Amino acid sequence: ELELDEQQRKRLEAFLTQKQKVGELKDDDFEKISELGAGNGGVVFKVSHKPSGLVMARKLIHLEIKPAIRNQIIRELQVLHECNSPYIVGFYGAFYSDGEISICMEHMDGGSLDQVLKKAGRIPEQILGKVSIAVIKGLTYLREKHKIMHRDVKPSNILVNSRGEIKLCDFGVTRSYMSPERLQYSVQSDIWSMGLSLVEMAVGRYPIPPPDAKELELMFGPMAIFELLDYIVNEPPPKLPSGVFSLEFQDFVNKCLIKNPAERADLKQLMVHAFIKRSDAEEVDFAGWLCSTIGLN
């Protein structure tokens, strides 16, 4: 089930008023603090917005592209101001300046699960249960309520904080010889992304290709991206190894990782899976686990 728990609506209103305290955003209303990390494209800084005194994360994507496409992006990014869930990172604004589109969002003191993974080795099953839930709720919210799909689920886009919230970020969107079958991915694709992320965090290794039992006991007791991209398409999906996880979890990742999208599980099929009902049951001191892992408190 999914509808704002009283303590969650108490934080969403808490945000929305602070966001009302912000208004319009522009380069000089900002001072950097720290680099929070980067990836392919935008670097992400911890920043303070002096008009409001609020601490934000600022993604600085680099454009230098056609103004027609640019204004159009800024235009369609605005919809995010109506994207307000406990399972989505708090949105502030999005603007152009300097030849660089920037996206200002709620700073998360725990960073991405990708960084959490690097400190933890593995993320334990019951923590992953709470993650699973969050991204499911955030996909469903985005799907049913804004007909948006994420199209970029992965550990770096699952953010966590010391309040023990888990939120998605980076929602952000006469001669041709192409196939008709090409000239025309679902929420079903996003689910594969979830599943695979789940395995990675579970075993602490990106599971493609899988490992032979020689590198596995050193856990439980070198290819180019094009080889990879091909392997993903042609070879069977990865799985959790057996013994070390519950059957309910082993199965849950499997239904997310069926190669054929048509047979793969959907949000509603997953929202009631054994592993999730049990996960929703459990009380997990996620906050506790998170701070100790990374050093906060």
Ligand X SMILES: Nc1ncnc2c1ncn2[C@@H]1O[C@H](COP(=O)(O)OP(=O)(O)NP(=O)(O)O)[C@@H](O)[C@H]1O
Q: Which residues are catalytic?
A: 152
For 39-153, where are the E strands, in sequence order? 43-49, 54-60, 91-95, 102-106
Tell which one of 49, 58, 59, 150 touches a second copy (CB under 8 A): 150
Q: Which amino acid is at 243?
A: G
Q: How far apart are CA 86 and CA 11, in angstroms?
A: 8
- Cis peptide leading into residue 238 (ω within 30°): no
Q: Which stretch binds Mg ion (CB under 5 A): 137-145, 152-160, 211-219, 262-270?
A: 152-160
Nearest residue (CB) to Mg ion, 89 versus 123: 89
Residues 161-190 that bind Mg ion (CB under 5 A): 170
Min CB(241)–Mg ion separation in Å: 28
Which range of residues in 23-31, 125-133, 181-189, 269-277 is near a second copy by CB under 8 A? 181-189
Residues numbered 226-255 forming contacts with a second copy, rule: CB under 8 A: 226-234
Residues that constitute the known binding site: 36-44, 59, 105-108, 112-115, 154-157, 170-173
Annotated binding site for K-252a: which residue ranges? Answer: 106-108, 156
Secondary structure of residue 80 in the 3-state scheme:
helix
Residue 173 makes contact with a second copy by CB under 8 A: no
| 59 versus 130: smaller Cβ distance to ligand X | 59
**Which one of Mg ion, ligand X, a second copy, none is in contact with 76 (Cβ closer than 5 to 8 A by kind)?**
a second copy
Q: Is 31 exposed, middle or buried (0-12, 13-18, 19+ CB in 10 A)?
A: exposed
Contacts with 114 (C-beta within 8 Å, 6 or more apart), sequence order = 154, 155, 156, 158
The CA-atom distances, in angstroms, between 215 and each of 121, 205, 212, 219 are 15, 11, 6, 7
Does position 211 interact with ligand X (CB under 6 A)? The reply is no
> Does the footprint of a second copy cover residue 64 (CB under 8 A)?
no
For residue 176, state whether it binds a second copy (rule: CB under 8 A): yes
Site string for ligand X, 115-154 (x = CB under 6 A): x------------------------------------x--
Q: Report yes or no: 113 and 153 within 8 Å, Cβ to Cβ.
A: no
168 vs 276 by CB, closer to ligand X: 168
Looking at beta carbons, which pairs linking 78-81 to residues 24 or more positions away fall under 8 Å?
79/146, 79/148, 80/171, 80/172
Q: To the nearest whole angstrom, how small is the minimum distance from the Cβ of residue 26 to a second copy? A: 24
- Residue type (1 letter), 154: K
Distances (CA, A) of 119 to 200, 220, 221: 14, 18, 21
147 binding partner (options ligand X, Mg ion, a second copy, none; Cβ < 5 to 8 Å by kind): a second copy
Listed ranges 4-12, 21-29, 111-119, 272-280: which one lies at the site for ligand X (CB under 6 A): 111-119
Contact 191, 270 (CB under 8 A): yes
Q: Which residue type sits at 258? A: I
- Residues in contact with a second copy by the rule CB under 8 A: 39-41, 75-76, 79-80, 146-150, 152-154, 174-186, 188-189, 192-193, 196-197, 200, 206, 208-209, 222-234, 259-261
